[PDB]
Symmetry: D3
Subunit: 266 residues, 6 copies
């Protein structure tokens, strides 16, 4: 029901100690990480990355948080790229990837360079009608050949991925939507309103199912590292079953686990 | 020529012994498996899956059948999912079937029913078709082909949206994201599906099975290699060099491969 | 588990009714044994043999009292010498062994050759008698198995040995097979079933759910999305056995919207 | 966007000497153009054509003045209509050569790109299509198939549903259909085909050639398993040689001493 | 190089401040050693132990004086006998650490403790080392790197045997199946381990990280590509272009 | 395969014309031998050497009388000690996609780039004096391509990391025990045994061998492997009736008619 989904959002500030970002949590379980350097179009420097890593780790471990929003301060930029070590954004990438909660990129204005890869790493992207996308690597002597390349191809296909990287053009919201680069385009004024609705729709669903599916979708891409995530959830599920608990109920008691009492399914 | 492609279809019933499905065969080589529980929007129960497996196995082994259509009875549902895990076997069976399998979708293709249409090689959708998953809404998920293979169809952003929110999508939305192959008016659903089937029936069945195996091989690792190499082995038996081994068994001697060219 | 239990006698009960080419037996303690029974032709399989093995394996899969399957050949001279020299449904049998959620053990005496060699490789484990002989013959007789027979063989013995085995088609004795990691152990011929049964019993003492998940996980390193289907399929099954997994179905029995808000959102 | 420079006239120099089936030209600003020149048979390739295209592509690859390659067909009616029916599977070698070419390869498509000719445009990094371009496979209609990059890689472009449709039915698709499914990068009026193609080439020419080759290798690496890793790691090895730490090994030869890596930072 | 250098005494400096479950030490010549220090429970890890190992490993990663990490257990009887699920984080961290990590194994490496040694790039085993999984025996499993990556070490037949039966394997059995890199007498365990570390320390650290990433890339799909391309990007920055 | 045939003398014919760095020879019974001929520098390759090996291998590939290729070094002391102190990557691809078995015949040193070359060969026959290992990290270099990943598919991940990270040397027995080479023979019998192995493969179906080589590469090479494997499937298809119906329908004017062919399960 739209009334619930479009209800006002009550944000509580958790930004204490952060210089480059704001970090907020809603009552209903949304964490928002906001890059707060609009003076440089929300470009990240190594400190920014360190803070985002801290905030994301906090959101991950907070049982009241079910969904994370990543965004930039103001209306003009999500993140315009690189401005605690030089390439620690790779760590942040892996952390978004393996976060068992959906991460949503909320994009107004520029999502460019390293900043473009960040939105792609997020599970979903909600774009304002003023959003601008693209890579800049080859123009400025750099490249992201990791998830920035391969994973981009799993989103827009190999022809578009080569075009995006090789020419380093800019793409508006409609172009991004048509190639499947973003999930939806909404008027700028409604950007948070629609993003929050999408978040709430996910919050109504099973968090265990979401994490299993996220791991399964990563598993199509990440080889054994994906298997680690998917199997890791299987192991966790197993512990919540009787057969899984029989080991712990037994083996502590130096006796012996007895699995004979369990069905051997087809 | 359209007159051939849009010619009437002569269906013969082969439904004997089936409770949940109809199974029919056309003269020109199309097998049609129809989920027949419209009273529950064509949801499958385990018996339904067992029968579909039987019908598909039959269609696979019938040398007169070149293409299979999977569909639901009536206009309101293709399949609305599991009834409120042998469907995994049915999935693998659709996957490794050496003949093209076409999902013919009217109304709802939802949940386990949505995965079934995705598993089919092609999907022909009526303008009233509705698509989506429900797993996370009802405490379940398909993290197998229902996730990874979905991503190979619509891309990772859309796949995550479809699974994480569990919304419904109409025919046009499905077409735009590449989830279905075409959208036709409901009244023409079988007419157009049959035309697509006939177009494939005019082509080389060996070529089709090799290509199907090759396309699965981009997804299914060694299991895909088993399919692809399996066809290679079959092709090899149909060649002179491949027959020299068997003929050497007959003539009570050693095979002699020296008489064969060693190509670049 | 104590040797007295592991080496206790075995009581096979016949379930071979209607089978021409195979014997099919089940033990009280949960072992199913499928025995190719054409020792006159060194246990070569013909299409009927494959059809019967498929039936027996499907039966063992669906029997909740069965935890482990043994695949073997009648007599001491051959496990299986390949396809009958006198269509390709053995590929179906391969996929069936692969996706069987219970451990399948190849018990090999004498020849495991050609299609018969691929069969033992497909099995999760191989217990070999000291008289066992292994190898491929494809290139010698105008054929090949480039599926699991090639790729999966490489995942067992490595790419150099896999190329040697296929390209030359030599034979390898039990010790050579053991040294290259092709079989799990070598035992005297007289103790073949005794030791095989012990290995089966050791697995039977363990969690069947853990075994199926691990089997699926190990296949997943090889079988791309087909492996993900197996692994995720177990995850789905596990999920149904949890409270959160049941809430969906209970919201149906009790006629209400599901409420997942009452569940923890773990890290 | 300096359209003045992106739409400046192109100065082509002929390098076709000794070629029977193709034209081969190079521009002053670094574009090589390989043109299949058999328009009487809709630019179908025979084995000689493939051999010549392989030679021309190898030349373009080794020419440091060349940054981008255009692959196209003579005239307006066909890019390439496939293998010559009236006649070597050496087109597979050409495929692998396009794939591993460390420079962007651009398919410039007018009229028919069909069969083997359709796979060729797909192998190219980008495809610029005229509004009259026609696409599709024919394998299953004429007892053949491309189950290699023609299948798997097609799927990485248009998705698995469309890939199966394209192969199983062997229909033809017009430029707009190709664009909508992501099969080509852009559709332009026929009269502007080379003008726009050259603009795209020049935009790439303005960028770092090392970055382009690394990215091309990285994108292939999502598809080509260890063969992809060979390309990607190969560029890493090349980059390493251009660094001080990479040169210390070679210099420890020149000054006759053991290499000393202790003087280098051990980064996180 | 020369054995006198490789077998020279090792000067350890303690960096264990604030740790309850582990010792953490650094040598002058660039080796960091993380020691699980719960020998009473055969060096089993609890969640705190994992948290501390994660901290120590992050520290070693960011210390430019450190070229190689040793992971080991206190005493002679156990490397680690096994076990919220934060050990998965530790696994990824060992995996993506751009410096070689060496498991130095005395006595038991079992269960989760067995997976940890496998995750390390190399394993130096004492003649008394014992290896194996226990998952299926105690209602658990590691179907991630504990399964697939194990297969990439010992082959699919042995990996299935190890997991399905959950037996124990002695040092010689582990060596024969390629599970460990070498077996040395217990009394020489650290001496030989330190030698292996010093041999790596003599080599190019950039080469080592690129190779480690390349070897992971054969296993880890796009995550492996991220590591490998990441190094390429880093190299690119060090060039004129 | 009776030993008298397998151990019969080998009649080599020289085809080295125009080569500076290599010898290239062919036997009557279908073996091509490429020999790196710079024993003064332990058979290290320089770019010219690679160019010549590429030419010789391309020739062997296109010679229908050749079924198997031996790659080796002149003398007894070295197979190849690596790059001379990047076209070798092309030579690697070329060994990889050569539809005929390539056998590394290794005496003495196979080191660095020279160690990767033996690994790329389908099989390796090693003399009891053979020495193996990488040197990259010692001399500021690395091979992170097939030199890494494919090495792991041979000896496993633990041994691969050891070989690369430490850059030690390994003798024949160590190489055999880790599965790095296929067999170790006395130095004096190196060619005798290598030729036997070649002859054993020469007795087998060359189509089967190329399909299997492609299938084994396919476990490693993603879509590039699929290209090889499907390429053979396409070739096989052309040799069948159903495959020829397309071509026969063009050269007879008509539409192809596939209805007359069975639709197998
Ligand atoms: Cl010609
Ligand atoms: Cl604690
Ligand atoms: Cl405490
Ligand atoms: Cl392996
Ligand atoms: Cl791979």
């Amino acid at each position: 029901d739209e009334a619930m989904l479009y209800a006002p959002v009550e944000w509580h500030d958790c930004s204490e100690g952060f210089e480059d970002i704001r970090y907020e949590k809603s009552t209903d379980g949304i964490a928002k990480i906001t890059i707060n350097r609009p003076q440089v179009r929300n470009a990240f420097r190594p400190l920014t990355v360190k803070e985002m890593i801290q905030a994301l780790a906090d959101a991950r471990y907070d049982d009241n948080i079910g969904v994370i929003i990543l965004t930039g301060a103001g209306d003009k930029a999500f993140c315009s790229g690189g401005d605690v070590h030089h390439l620690n954004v790779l760590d942040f990438q892996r952390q978004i990837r393996t976060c068992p909660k959906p991460v949503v990129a909320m994009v107004a204005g520029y999502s460019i360079g390293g900043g473009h890869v960040l939105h792609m790493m997020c599970d979903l992207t909600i774009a304002a009608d003023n959003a601008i996308f693209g890579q800049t690597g080859p123009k400025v002597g750099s490249f992201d050949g990791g998830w920035g390349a391969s994973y981009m191809a799993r989103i827009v296909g190999q022809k578009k991925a080569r075009e995006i990287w090789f020419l380093c053009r800019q793409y508006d919201a409609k172009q991004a939507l048509d190639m499947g680069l973003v999930n939806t385009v909404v008027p700028l004024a409604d950007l948070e309103k629609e993003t929050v609705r999408w978040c709430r729709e996910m919050l109504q669903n099973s968090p265990m199912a979401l994490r299993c599916l996220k791991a399964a979708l990563n598993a199509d891409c990440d080889g054994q590292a994906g298997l680690q995530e998917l199997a890791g959830n299987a192991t966790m599920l197993f512990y919540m079953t009787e057969e899984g608990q029989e080991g712990r109920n037994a083996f502590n008691q130096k006796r012996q686990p007895d699995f004979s009492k369990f069905k051997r399914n087809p």
